[model samples]
Target: SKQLAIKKMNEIQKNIDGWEGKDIGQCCNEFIMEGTLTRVGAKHERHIFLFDGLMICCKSNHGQPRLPGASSAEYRLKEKFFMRKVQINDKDDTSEYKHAFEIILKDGNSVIFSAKSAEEKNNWMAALISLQYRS
Candidate 1:
């Protein structure tokens, strides 16, 4: 199942104009980070690819880089979508959504993402915050 998903991703990338020979870095123009993260309330997982200027959530966990919603219906990160803030859950929150942080966008839209560990959450938060400044 996973293998096929990857194959589809590759095929999609090859067919897309300007994406034929580009790596993730080349596709985004500058690479920063990439990892797998499940969207809130989504049954299937997605691969989150972060670049110096934008973010991309691909439909497959493994893939050649492409824009979000290229293969599935989901939010696409744009260069203008600046990060406004990040809200980390507190110990007293007592929710299954612990170890999660919300990526607040400048336009008032937000996406919540949970990491496997608290440390991972912190790392993502830091990277996102840094990107906002650089962006």
Candidate 2:
């Protein structure tokens, strides 16, 4: 588990500098969620964050030094997206000990994220749901 966490943090650090090149002004608010991502075929842990209306998914590795400038995949959390919490079972194989949820876009595309603890999963769900209503 620790190794997975470390690997994820390294992934996050790799994309952390993505914001440096932009003039988005200071982030009004931010929330970090440690979870596994399934955007790719092979699942990998990632550090997901929300800054204002920007939703960013980055690799999770954090122990390494930050890079000068890096870029990450960004999604605008607006009317175009839907957020919901879903039950993950053995079929999903995402996590046997963790809870999971998804963020579905207008086009029916979705990203599944897993939280190691139920409390953390609930927090992420709440935060994501709140973002949908911020407008």
Candidate 3:
């Protein structure tokens, strides 16, 4: 597990924007999930990460040069927020997006994200709910 902790920290550094570099305790799966944020006209596809407490939401910057070992940093940061100041709300289903939920931010605004599958949505819900309640 020595290397795994290092590995996880490295991932956090690569994905999260404005990170001087950091880490913390626990996980409900600390990885990126591709989902759509409900918006006007089109449902915006956004890549999201739940790590420590920050929601590292990003958009894929396609066709970029890969680093020697692997390609990282291709994801451009879209929205970043702390779970401490965020809350989530559930929705039944829309005519278009079947699996959707709202993430209410501290700024008194919320964004809806629709997952590709119900299972994925549940995983996100589990991750977000678990993270948001922490100090």
Candidate 4:
């Protein structure tokens, strides 16, 4: 069921280009954008795009807005991305394990977990908000 749902979601997301109207892809993308902005703050211009056949969603921070995490500034970004991935995957399942997958970026950034339920997806948004306030 989850696999089917994800397939459908991915299919819908790939068809749309911009954030307009209340379509499925638009709604999903908007939620992601809002979540990222909330957690990471609006200081920087961020881009959220679906790559690898919409199997992977990436949030890239270009300028402005920064957060705390590891020694390298890029670490914070990677951590935030990974946090989003994990949290998103943790949302549903209703499983005790709620296992998550990890994606390690070429720049040494690692993101784990899959986007499953609403709660998990929202966790990514919350993370962005948390990062926004941290010194």
Candidate 5:
């Protein structure tokens, strides 16, 4: 399912190549994941739930205006996606896994998000929702 999502996203990318690094509309159905993540302070094995998404990145609404200074009518679109990576053990230890995400917008903005704990994940969502005036 994740691979299929990535492939679909790539197709969307090809379709909108002209506006690469610029604001574009959202693209649905794409995922990218690594297999594991290193434990923050633990030596033993740990497992993390994988994250998936289709849109993750977007232009900063509070930043400076876009090129040509069109702040009133210009709203940069962002795409969001989720993924996970794995850390392999070399000494017969169990490998660990972590969750992450990559977001790329049409305006040349990109970012990767990670959650190491439930609280962190909640904080992230709270921040994002706050941007929309959500409580």
Candidate 6:
């Protein structure tokens, strides 16, 4: 059996920059996940995660070591959005990327994220929508 979620949360709280401990100060419920998104802001790729009140993205280094162990450190912070101030945009645009969704902030700026597969698209889309009602 796997009991790594709490541990992973601890690790993430420690390594992810600007993520002050249990900073969700907004809720008692926390939904979490991590994944890769392509051409994130610029042409650079990043790792993104959803954890309750915050939608955070981090710098990924596919630059791995040998075969059997973890890397020196994990993801670094790229972006962090408290859903209270951002809106999820499931817009249609030339049907671009086949699996892309946009996230628009109150500042009027936006970003698109393309998941790796169809189901990944479905769930993430639904997750964003459901989260819209959360905080």
| All candidates: CA RMSD (Å) | 10.9, 12.3, 8.6, 14.6, 15.3, 8.6
Pick out the ten consecutive residues of candidate 4 with the lowest summed lDDT.
34-43
Put down candidate 1 lDDT per residue, 5-35, tens digits, no spaces: 3343333334442221344433332334455
Q: C-alpha displacement of 32 in model 2, angstroms?
A: 6.7
- lDDT by residue for model 3 (1-135), tens: 566643544456455433223333344234433343332224555666666455656665664566634755555456655555666677766655566677777676775566655676665666667765764
Instruction: For each candidate in the order shown, give its overall lDDT on alpha carbons.
Output: 0.47, 0.43, 0.54, 0.36, 0.35, 0.54
Which lDDT value does model 4 have at 135? 13
Pick the winner on TM-score between candidates 1 and 6.
6
Task: Residues 1-135, candidate 4: write the lDDT tens digits.
Answer: 556644654454456443423345422333333222222212332333322112224344443345656433431122122222222223334444333333344565544433344454454434444433431
lDDT of 6 by residue, 41-89 (tens): 2455666666654566666555544653554555345665555456556
Question: Which ten-residue region of model 5 has the weakest summed lDDT?
Answer: 84-93
**Candidate 4 residue-wise lDDT at 77:** 24
Q: For model 1, state the Cα shift of residue 7 in Å.
A: 20
Two-way TM-score contest, 2 vs 4, winner = 2
Tens digit per residue, CA lDDT, model 5, 1-135:
557655654455445443314323342222122122223333432222122333333344445555754536445433434321212111221234343333344455443344455445333433333333421
In model 6, the clashing pairs are none
Q: Give candidate 6 regions above 4 Å deviation.
A: 1-31, 39-44, 61-75, 93-96
Candidate 4 vs. true structure, TM-score: 0.24
Model 1, position 67, has a per-residue lDDT of 63
Report how far residue 97 has shifted in candidate 3, in Å: 3.7
List where candidate 5 sits over 4 angstroms from the true fold.
Answer: 1-97
Residue 125 of model 2: what lDDT? 59
Instruction: Give the runs in model 2 whose Cα sits over 4 Å from its true position.
Output: 1-29, 32-43, 60-98
In terms of lDDT, the poorest run of 10 residues in model 3 is 32-41
Residue 118 miss distance in model 5 (angstroms): 1.9
